[PDB]
Amino acid sequence: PHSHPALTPEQKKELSDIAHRIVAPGKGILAADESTGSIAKRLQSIGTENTEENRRFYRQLLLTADDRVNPCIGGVILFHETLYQKADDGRPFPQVIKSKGGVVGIKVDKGVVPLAGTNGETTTQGLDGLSERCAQYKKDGADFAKWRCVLKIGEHTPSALAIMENANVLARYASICQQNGIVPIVEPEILPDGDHDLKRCQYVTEKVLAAVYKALSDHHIYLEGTLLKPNMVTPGHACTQKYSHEEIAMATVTALRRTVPPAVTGVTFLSGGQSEEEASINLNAINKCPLLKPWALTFSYGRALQASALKAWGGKKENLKAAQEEYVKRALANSLACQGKYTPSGQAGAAASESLFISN
Amino acid sequence: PHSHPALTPEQKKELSDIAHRIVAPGKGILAADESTGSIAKRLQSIGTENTEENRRFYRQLLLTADDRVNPCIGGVILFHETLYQKADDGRPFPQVIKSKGGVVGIKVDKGVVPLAGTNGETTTQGLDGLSERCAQYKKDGADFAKWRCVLKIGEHTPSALAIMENANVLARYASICQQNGIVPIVEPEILPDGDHDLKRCQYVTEKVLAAVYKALSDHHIYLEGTLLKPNMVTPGHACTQKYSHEEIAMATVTALRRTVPPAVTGVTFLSGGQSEEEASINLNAINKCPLLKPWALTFSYGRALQASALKAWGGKKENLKAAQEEYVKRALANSLACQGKYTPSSNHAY
Amino acid sequence: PHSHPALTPEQKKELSDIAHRIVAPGKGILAADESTGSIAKRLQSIGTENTEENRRFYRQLLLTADDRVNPCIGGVILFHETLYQKADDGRPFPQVIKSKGGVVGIKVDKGVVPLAGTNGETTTQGLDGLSERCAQYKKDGADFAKWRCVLKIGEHTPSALAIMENANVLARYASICQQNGIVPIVEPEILPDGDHDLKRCQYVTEKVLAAVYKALSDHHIYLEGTLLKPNMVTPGHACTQKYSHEEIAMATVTALRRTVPPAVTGVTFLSGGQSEEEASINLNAINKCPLLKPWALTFSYGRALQASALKAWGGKKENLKAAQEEYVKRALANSLACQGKYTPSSNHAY
Amino acid sequence: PHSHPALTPEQKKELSDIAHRIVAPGKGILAADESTGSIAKRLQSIGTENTEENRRFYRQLLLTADDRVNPCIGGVILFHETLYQKADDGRPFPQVIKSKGGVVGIKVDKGVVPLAGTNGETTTQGLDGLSERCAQYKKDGADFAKWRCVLKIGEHTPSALAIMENANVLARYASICQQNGIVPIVEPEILPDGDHDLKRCQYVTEKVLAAVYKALSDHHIYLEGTLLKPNMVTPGHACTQKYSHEEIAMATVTALRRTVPPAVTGVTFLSGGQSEEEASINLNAINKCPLLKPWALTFSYGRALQASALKAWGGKKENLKAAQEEYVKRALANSLACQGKYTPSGQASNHAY
Structure with a gap:
């Protein structure tokens, strides 16, 4: 019942300013934080x-x-690795990113681990020494971080334990981050895996986010200095029933309106296996949804921004320009999407129309 | 992890529609639900x-x-008593209210009870037979209800128990109301008693509201079909430090922005002891606050709408017109206030 | 982090003494609290x-x-009704009970109600004015009370909400009772309905009881001044897999040892549909289970003590002694059972 | 509402057997797990x-x-360091301990860290890579572990957050341990620092332990395969009011009876600053307390078993035998104390709580 300020007004300002810069109108996030074992795939x-x-x-x-x-x-x-790598001109990648008006973010979780006594559920590790790591990442150019928790929709999942534990660890991570001037991106991803329908995903997403924000409150998290990276609300990847983009948008925005406090600076959707075009079209529909949305609704795409680029590159240096062109096209598409001004056309190749779904 | 729909789309539309009508632009709530013992003083x-x-x-x-x-x-x-009384011309009060464009509401709690093992804290009773009561009230004209929980800021309060228990009973109440087509006004009032400052109130308000909404979620409450009646964020009555209306407005809006989901149709502030003028000036400041507010920010005033009217009446029928005039003036004042157009005569520091 | 004694040492002594008297060695409870609608069947x-x-x-x-x-x-x-009735000799039933060395108890809950948004789950009502009712019941001879919550094992039940809410209302009821010198019997009954096996019941029972005691702790309940009336751990009534009394006793004692603090004065098992003989045999096996049991393990039987008595009676006044004889037989059988002295004449797998 | 067995009957048996061997009648635990920085002091x-x-x-x-x-x-x-060191004869320390009938334990937490937004409260870290560490420790001779959480009694502490968070991390730690055949010792230490009285400590101890076991339940922890290492219930160090050992025992035992499920195999008290003799007398009193105690009530002493030995040694090889004698004497005293047979001689209303 007694307040013990976790942050000073000066600290809040820094975090808030950082968070707003990241989701400034028309802007989104490029998620290139694949681990060594992940990018290898x-x-x-x-x-x-x-x-x-x-x-x-x-x-x-x-x-x-x-x-x-x-x-x-x-x-x-x-x-981590990329944060300390340099471009051909000798410039550290963080400098490269900043010179282009971008904020540098660092993934800090250490992957998922199994929760004993659950049906294949997990929590995420990475809190040990996180404070020292954040202080160091801050000095080296990073202003925000990301931590991924993974939940799955099934007959008995997500369980009460999985929801509570994952929500708690996200809160711990966000707390440590803010103590070091780093904006934490809270990512409670609910996988699209399964044959559940749209309303099932909406239900679960609402319960999960409610848990996430209660935990963030219990841990005294400064919401204005955070971002949310949730899954969009969609039917399962193996669901038979078909839905329109307007429906996916309505379910997504409704779920968020029922759980995300207006103080949250912005929501940066993960693409989660959706095709490059599907991710852009859905984000666009979300921003066009006829409901009041008190937070920025943009992107934090990994696969949805790299599909075509990877294919065009093929690992050959000569395909440098070609690869960058594909990336730029998706960045432009999504930039318009987070403004509800995106209108599909007929290019972006067929690689942008293929599902990037990866079963877990 | 499985959904068992508490309400049908039709039930949802009804609740949502009622909620939106109550807090339509420029509109607020007249809280005349004082019990016999309450109206006594x-x-x-x-x-x-x-x-x-x-x-x-x-x-x-x-x-x-x-x-x-x-x-x-x-x-x-x-x-309750009033819901079944009639005006002189024989018209049931519910009919009078409705003919003037207002929705009829009914207070359904049965007062506070002490929570053993706490420093004078309480919870609220009234759930017994509530479903049947709501069905009867609905049939008799009421479309929304009110339930009041009371918390106090002190050295050891509100405690974890008080916050958790009051949030839980509010959720039960809300659930029962929605099952009977009644829009529940969730009122978790944090008393202004004490010498605590503005920061203290804001902190406690943020924690209480966060608890309230987690409980509403756990009980599957349809937020769009609800309204929130909280205290504005203000320093305690005995606080020596003084603040401007802009500051209490900033603290109030900031606290709501950090806890109240956008889906909540509206916030109807209680005046909780503030004077008629102060309550109107604060509501006005709240609506002009330079921050994004995704819900209607209006009033649910009891004392702040009746103070002058009650005095002018003096219990003398002769003063009917005089009394009503005072009420009308406050109704007009607050209507402008919830629009940020009343005149009586971001900050990371929150 | 701060304490505000809900009870004085004198109040604690009173409650503890009462609870111990009820479950003194070889003693159990006769549950004859069937409501008008219940006794009707x-x-x-x-x-x-x-x-x-x-x-x-x-x-x-x-x-x-x-x-x-x-x-x-x-x-x-x-x-309620019975607490105020008299025997043919004009003596009120509470006096009859007391003169025979028994403590008088009163059921105070007002039945179950549906929890919206769940798959047919319920919570229990009866808290309104419970304090005044308890004070009156105390004056009229009762020293303990009973409140029944019902949970069901199913595809998605008991849900998190159902467990949390029922645990919470039990804590509220217990709190109110102790403030009035009434020992509360906490009854979180998990129905035997279904085809689930022994393991599933033990699992659900362990989770439910852990929730009950955490709630009791949050509400500052004095455990020494309470009794627990749980379901024994048994396979579902329609489970195809069969088990022995020893397995039922092991599953039951294991579940309790993993959740019931030693401070709880006694565990008074409900018979829950078991036959008179079965209820006695299982109670006996429970008391013979080779594991340490820090609390009295006795009975609070309704049907298990009345089945034959009601049948021998048949509504005929001339079958009085015949019916009483059947009741006496089950009382004797169960008295021996709660002592592990009743004859019808790898614990890591749990 | 559905069970997904975290442990098989075989795994449960191993954990239960280990836990019981550690607190067998007359036995306690020597806590010599001081880290480099800690032992430096x-x-x-x-x-x-x-x-x-x-x-x-x-x-x-x-x-x-x-x-x-x-x-x-x-x-x-x-x-960690000690688990991999050897005696002069070349025997690994774990082997030395085992040959003397003792079970080998390993401290696995990585210290406390500050909880932002609290009044100087902390939680404990060390879950990262913990499963791999436990698998390795198991293979290297350890059968149980220790994780220490620290709470403080003050005007606003322990706060709801501190209690919840520390209870949660302990559960996670316990869960990982049991998946690797390691019996977790749950240590939610409530420091004795402060001027609070006996009833204040009992109150906080009761609330903390209630939180701990609810968390263990939520995380599906097999209680029979765990031990509890709590603070005894005593007045704060700066408390002006004096209490007898009988009252300390009554308050301690009462707090445990109200929160610790009988399934818990044993309670191994920390000495937390008490003198060697004080820790022994209190433990003896606890064991003589006239209340039903369904779990072994013994010791897990660090300072209370090493104080005199450390001093008698002075860092001189010459005093080896003298220093070992002091340790043995405390080991004997406490062995008698966890049986309620301790006496200065040698080796021969509870409703107000």
């Missing part, structure tokens, strides 16, 4: 061996795209 | 015996004020 | 009109059995 | 340089004490 789908150099080059390819992306990208999430 | 302060007749006459006086109040009053909260 | 099953007199007679029949039941009965739970 | 009090060799020599001093300690020590908690 991507490079593997293009006959490119996973080496530090190939990874460096690939990240450079995306980070050094032409100035057309500048207005589209408010922030870029990187993996 | 009011009448006592003016030397008027607490009889059913005087209560009926007083309530009639307010409910029949001239049409100038119509666009100001979106809803009227009544005490 | 019982009387109807034997073709007897459900009249106040017939209910009075049947209750008299049970309460005035010979002294052989005295050492068997530590307490008797009555329904 | 102990070594400084006797003007001894904090080098790995001195630490090894010190730990060796305690672990190789004569066979009189065998029936007194059911378990020994070691810091």
